[PDB]
Design a protein around this ligand. Structure first.
Ligand SMILES: C[C@@H](C(=O)O)C(=O)SCCNC(=O)CCNC(=O)[C@H](O)C(C)(C)COP(=O)(O)OP(=O)(O)OC[C@H]1O[C@@H](n2cnc3c(N)ncnc32)[C@H](O)[C@@H]1OP(=O)(O)O
Ligand SMILES: CC(C(=O)O)C(=O)O
Lengths: 510, 169
């Protein structure tokens, strides 16, 4: 220790500079050469200028086996602390790959869990940039225990404070389960994630696959269904994280703050021409979404996964809302195993964070297929019914066109607790297709009998007016007034207070 | 029979909404007016802030069939329900239409009223109801009697939670 305070302050600065250098210039240049920002650059770009308040820069590992006694491991490989994003307090962590490949030391995990506990304690969002080789192998069961504590903490925070994961490099092995337990995963094109690596896969199964093919951003988005956003690079991931956060509240006791409200609810006749009266013609349901939400703005979640169903955050008069909409232009808009998961996850999240749910319905039923049955569509589709039935946030449903049987119920009709349901004049709510219906009711009895009975069943049940006669929709409306109808419902139900039966939790389908 | 274009259907929708709003028809509306009484919709339009009424169940229809109910056309089943504002304050309201079968309380009508009350309770807003009726709809027997049981239970459920104001007109 220096001889004076001024001198000890200078010493402290030099020492802190060494810590912040991480694995050294060479390793940092390699990180940059791979097109990656450093752990500290990521936090500096994400958080408001100079808001980062670091905890544990001088924290050190206590492990000693297999070289750890002599190893110099700055911040134990992770940078943790608190800062602000557009003035909102948040807690964050960022793995430093230049330090022992970002491997998760026991202390590193403790630092991360402590930051998570502070986020919970104070009710603020928690963000984490992952870039690591997984549990630090030299620490054996010590690093193992650290992960156990981290996963438990992710679950403790679940549904309490929003958790966002940004995979910005490797994420080799069980470490991947932390991102799975957070609410949203943003993955860059320089990142990889998997439970078992390509080499081990080859050694055990004989299969040949590259890291990219196995667990690159595209694989996780389109095939695995593991991630919510794909980002080209760190800058993009940082922009996406902020945009995402802007729609969410700080914690579960509050509703997200309104942002740049457009209070106009004037009609837009353009809405009448997006959905074809011809049932055989599709369209992009996002064109409807664009004309009804503020400024046409929305952030689509899982945009490249199960595209037969759209899940997106947007705003109506400045209020955050979650939109779930069938996509007629993809697989005729059928719901299937993957879309059921995609929708259920979204609904459960919005409900946890007091975000109203708006449904745009045009579904002909679930996707037919032996593999859909063999894949358990019964238990996966049930997830949609479960999520909506459990949800207590305002639920507003607008039936644009087809609304057949169980798939219609899965899109939250009145019976599943929708607070307001509106039918466009093209709404076709039915237990099943008229043809399939007749083939059963009128099995007994030319060929014109069939075509005649079809028309009969159709007119008797599948028009917007019958749905309204039965009270299944509150009104039949001019598509042009869709925005106003949703806005007014959101406004009246802004004071909704709905309680559920006492329980630790229900038994959500797996 | 639905029109071939969305535009046609929207125009079609407007024409049908007009028929419902005409309730029991000109003659009966004239009779209501001649008795120094406003109609169910005029009452809501007069009570609520201009243009704030958002109606629920305009196209709702009874499902009863006995003693001529199977052929009877009963607009909104005799009650106009929804939400609006009074000096900007959110409220829920119901207004019985005497021009439709003497405003007799049909089963569906009572269901419409109860659902509106449940929404007032759910959203913590006041509930106002204009009464103008010959009582439970006799043609529906116990079906309409059941409707009143549900209404009374609802009134009590709301009692002391949200203000309830009744206007006998
Ligand atoms: C619990 C659990 C589980 O999965 O269930 C565990 O987590 S068992 C977890 C097992 N996890 C793993 O086996 C995977 C580890 N190794 C890798 O696949 C790879 O390292 C990789 C894809 C992360 C990185 O590839 P890369 O070529 O970019 O890089 P490098 O090989 O240079 O490595 C970065 C430096 O970090 C070190 N390094 C990487 N991962 C670890 C780790 N888990 N523990 C200790 N050191 C590690 C490397 O030895 C290397 O050391 P130096 O500079 O000294 O050469
Ligand atoms: C198998 C494996 C371990 O765990 C890995 O990361 O490949």
């Amino acid at each position: 220790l220096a001889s004076t305070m001024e001198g000890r302050v200078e010493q402290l600065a030099e020492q802190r500079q060494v810590i912040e250098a991480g694995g050294g210039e060479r390793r940092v240049e390699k990180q940059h050469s791979q097109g990656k920002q450093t752990a500290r650059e990521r936090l500096n770009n994400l958080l408001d200028p100079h808001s980062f308040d670091e905890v544990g820069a001088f924290r050190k590992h206590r492990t000693t086996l297999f070289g750890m006694d002599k190893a110099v491991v700055p911040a134990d490989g992770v940078v943790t602390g608190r800062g602000t994003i557009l003035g909102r307090p948040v807690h964050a962590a960022s793995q430093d790959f230049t330090v022992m490949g970002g491997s998760a030391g026991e202390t590193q995990s403790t630092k991360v869990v402590e930051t998570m506990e502070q986020a919970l304690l104070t009710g603020t969002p928690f963000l984490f940039f992952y870039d690591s080789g997984g549990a630090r192998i030299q620490e054996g069961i010590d690093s193992l225990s650290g992960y156990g504590k981290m996963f438990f903490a992710n679950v403790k925070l679940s549904g309490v404070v929003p958790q966002i994961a940004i995979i910005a490099g490797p994420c080799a092995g069980g470490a991947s389960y932390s991102p799975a337990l957070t609410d949203f995963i943003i993955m860059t094109k320089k990142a990889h994630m998997f439970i078992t690596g390509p080499q081990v896969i080859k050694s055990v199964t004989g299969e040949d696959v590259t890291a990219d093919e196995l667990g690159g951003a595209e694989a996780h988005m389109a095939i695995s269904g593991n991630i919510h956003f794909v980002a080209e690079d760190d800058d993009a991931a940082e922009l996406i994280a902020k945009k995402l956060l802007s729609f969410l509240p700080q914690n579960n006791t509050e509703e997200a703050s309104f942002v740049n409200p457009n209070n106009d609810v004037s009609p837009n006749t353009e809405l009448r021409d997006i959905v074809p009266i011809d049932g055989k013609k599709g369209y992009d349901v996002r064109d409807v979404i664009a004309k009804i939400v503020d400024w046409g703005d929305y952030l689509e979640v899982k945009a490249g996964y199960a595209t037969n169903l759209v899940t997106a955050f947007a705003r109506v008069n400045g209020r955050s809302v979650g939109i779930v909409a069938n996509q007629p232009s993809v697989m005729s808009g059928c719901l299937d195993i993957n879309a059921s998961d995609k929708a259920a996850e979204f609904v459960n999240f919005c409900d946890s964070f007091n975000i109203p749910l708006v449904q745009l319905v045009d579904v002909p039923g679930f996707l037919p297929g032996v593999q859909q049955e063999y894949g358990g569509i019964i238990r996966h589709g049930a997830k949609m019914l479960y999520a909506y039935s459990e949800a207590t946030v305002p639920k507003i449903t607008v039936v644009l066109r087809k609304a057949y049987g169980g798939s219609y119920l899965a899109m939250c009709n009145r019976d599943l607790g929708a607070d307001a349901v509106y039918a466009w004049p093209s709404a076709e709510i039915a237990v099943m297709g008229a043809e399939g219906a007749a083939n059963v009711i009128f099995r007994k009895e030319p060929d014109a009998m069939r075509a005649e009975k079809i028309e009969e069943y159709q007119n008797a049940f599948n028009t917007p007016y019958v749905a309204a006669a039965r009270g299944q929709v509150d009104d039949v409306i001019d598509p042009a007034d869709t925005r106003r109808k949703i806005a007014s419902a959101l406004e009246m139900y802004a004071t909704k207070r709905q309680t559920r039966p006492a329980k630790k939790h229900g038994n959500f389908p797996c | 029979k639905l029109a071939s274009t969305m535009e046609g259907r929207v125009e079609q929708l407007a024409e049908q909404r007009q028929v419902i709003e005409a309730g029991g028809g000109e003659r009966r509306v004239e009779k209501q007016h001649s008795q120094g009484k406003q109609t169910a919709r005029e009452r809501l339009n007069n009570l609520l802030d201009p243009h704030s009424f958002d109606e629920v169940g305009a196209f709702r229809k009874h499902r009863t069939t006995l003693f001529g109910m199977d052929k009877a056309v009963v607009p909104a089943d005799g009650v106009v329900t929804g939400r609006g504002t009074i000096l900007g304050r959110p409220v829920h309201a119901a207004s019985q239409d005497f021009t439709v079968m003497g405003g007799s309380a049909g089963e569906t009508q009572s269901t419409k009223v109860v659902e509106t009350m449940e929404q007032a309770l759910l959203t913590g807003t006041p509930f106002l109801f204009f009464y103008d009726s010959g009582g439970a709809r006799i043609q529906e027997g116990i079906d309409s009697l059941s409707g009143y049981g549900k209404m009374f239970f609802a009134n009590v459920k709301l009692s002391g939670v949200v203000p309830q104001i009744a206007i006998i007109a």
